[PDB]
Design a protein around this ligand. Structure first.
Ligand SMILES: [Zn+2]
Ligand SMILES: [Zn+2]
Ligand SMILES: [Zn+2]
Ligand SMILES: [Zn+2]
Lengths: 328, 328
């Protein structure tokens, strides 16, 4: 209630500080890093790259990241703890399910899924004792029958524990509207939910319809852009053709509409990425060499020059994540 | 070449003895047993159930099982080693990919997949040092583009190492024909391939077309039957409405056609099964309380009473698996 669970234990709300609410140490699949570490060069190479990136983010002012990798995104909390220890950056781990649940998850009931999410929040992840501080869910268009169960189980786990929910959307398909409907049918407060990848769309009617009913809006992929890589079909499909400035200006748009307290900003960066095409991490790193430091080093000064007060940006990067993550 | 790799190290061909060539300790998904052991009651309960079942199989004459669980079927070779040690039954582990590859596998090239399979055969699975003795692959109808890559990578790994390939089919769709075509396009000898779940069909033209060109025929689900459970839709979809006697008589049919040296027989049993509906293991155990001992306790005497000589059944259960598994 007055503590947020991290991969190194509980921290006070004050300790979280500048917080990136949607990040990944490694976007993978369950068991994959253990079974095929050479895909990333080596496990040690992945750790070192992550520690260097988090250290640079910490020098730019970041104090906490929320790693929203789930079980099926290959979340390895022992890896997160090692990297968090070495970089002196808090890492909040996630439960929930992302875009790639295996059969052993896809065949489960809403009650079974709730047990699993509660296990990772209340007891621990695997045998590590590390407890999730957030629940991650996903749709990519209209929800599959199973995804409806996942969203309902996430609501039930959140209602039992006060831990918030954050989502993956196909933003241009307005997924947040169906996600909101399911969450609200289970009695979940919108104040406990971040509708993520919302910077993937320019539709202000969709974004303000979510914000008006109390949802937090995840503008979490600001440096994702393939402008300058139209040659590259896979990178264009993943990153889009909208500039980082266009994405960042949605932060100002929601501020100007009165929603500054409901905005959560992040990079959605990673240090390894096996769940997409080979060498995508190299392509992404050439687009954005600042990595997770892109928000404080480039987005914050950009919004300042566009006239957003520093106090407003401090509220967005410090106050909003603390209010969101604090169990309630 | 003169050794078969098991989860406890290499064994001589003579040590394999009576061998069940298609079995599972636990049909699951990667990482699932680690993340949610309570699904199986407990990890300790799963181990104990498996040790009891293997001990009963050993008392019935079984000396070796081939666990054809892949990475994506949740193969845990440390679990296999513990159960193999406690029951004094050799267990051969598998590499390859089954019906549920995650994104981090599905996006890989044929070259990358070959590296992964070779890793598990030549170096070891995860950090355990345990090496696979067989490569498992799967189609369920016409092969997906990715499944074509898996089959080709399996052929390449087999050609480099001499380790055999065994397959999952939708037998009534005659999957073995396309599997054979892809394998042969890569230069793989049919003598290194078992076309599995072949007892799911009664089509003798399909079965003899595979056997005639040299494939081994996996009659591996003999006790799978939902006769007596027409009420149960999920069990009927999984197990089928053909009797175990009907499946077992395919063994005699292929013997009578001259293929006794190409028949491999098994139960396709499991001690846990999270990749299907909840409580399926209870349903399956009520259908077949003998578990993995069903082949020696019921199928062998049944074929004897139908006139198959004991020497022929000994060739099928001892000689054929040794010839198949011996790297060449
Ligand atoms: Zn996402
Ligand atoms: Zn993400
Ligand atoms: Zn199968
Ligand atoms: Zn099987």
């Amino acid at each position: 209630g007055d503590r947020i669970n991290t991969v190194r234990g509980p921290i006070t709300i004050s300790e979280a500080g500048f917080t990136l609410t949607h990040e990944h140490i490694c976007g993978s699949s369950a068991g994959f890093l253990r079974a095929w570490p050479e895909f990333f060069g080596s496990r040690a190479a992945l750790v070192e790259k992550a520690v260097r990136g988090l250290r640079r983010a910490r020098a730019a002012g970041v104090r906490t990241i929320v790693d929203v990798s789930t079980f099926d995104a290959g979340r390895d909390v022992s890896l997160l703890a090692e990297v968090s220890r070495a970089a002196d950056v808090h890492i909040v781990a996630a439960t929930g399910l992302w875009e790639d649940p295996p059969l052993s998850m896809r065949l489960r009931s809403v009650e079974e899924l709730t047990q699993f999410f509660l296990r990772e929040i209340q007891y621990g992840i695997e045998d590590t004792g590390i407890r999730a501080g957030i629940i991650k869910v996903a749709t990519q268009g209209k929800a599959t029958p199973f995804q409806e169960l996942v969203l309902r189980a996430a609501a039930r786990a959140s209602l039992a524990t006060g831990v918030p929910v954050t989502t993956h959307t196909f933003a241009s398909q307005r997924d947040g509207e169906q996600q909101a409907a399911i969450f609200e049918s289970e009695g979940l407060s919108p104040s406990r939910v971040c509708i993520g990848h919302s910077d993937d769309t320019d539709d202000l009617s969709y974004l303000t319809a979510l914000a008006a009913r109390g949802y937090l809006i995840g503008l979490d992929g600001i440096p994702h852009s393939a402008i300058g890589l139209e040659d590259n079909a896979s990178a264009s499909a993943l990153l889009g053709n909208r500039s980082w400035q266009t994405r960042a200006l949605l932060i100002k748009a929601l501020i100007d509409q009165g929603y500054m307290k409901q905005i959560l900003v992040s990079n959605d960066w990673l240090f390894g990425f096996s769940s997409y095409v080979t060498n995508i991490m190299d392509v992404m790193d050439s687009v954005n060499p600042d990595g997770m430091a892109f928000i404080p080093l480039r987005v914050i000064p950009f919004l300042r020059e566009k006239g957003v007060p520093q106090e407003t940006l401090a509220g967005i990067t410090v106050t909003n994540p603390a209010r969101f993550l604090s169990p309630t």
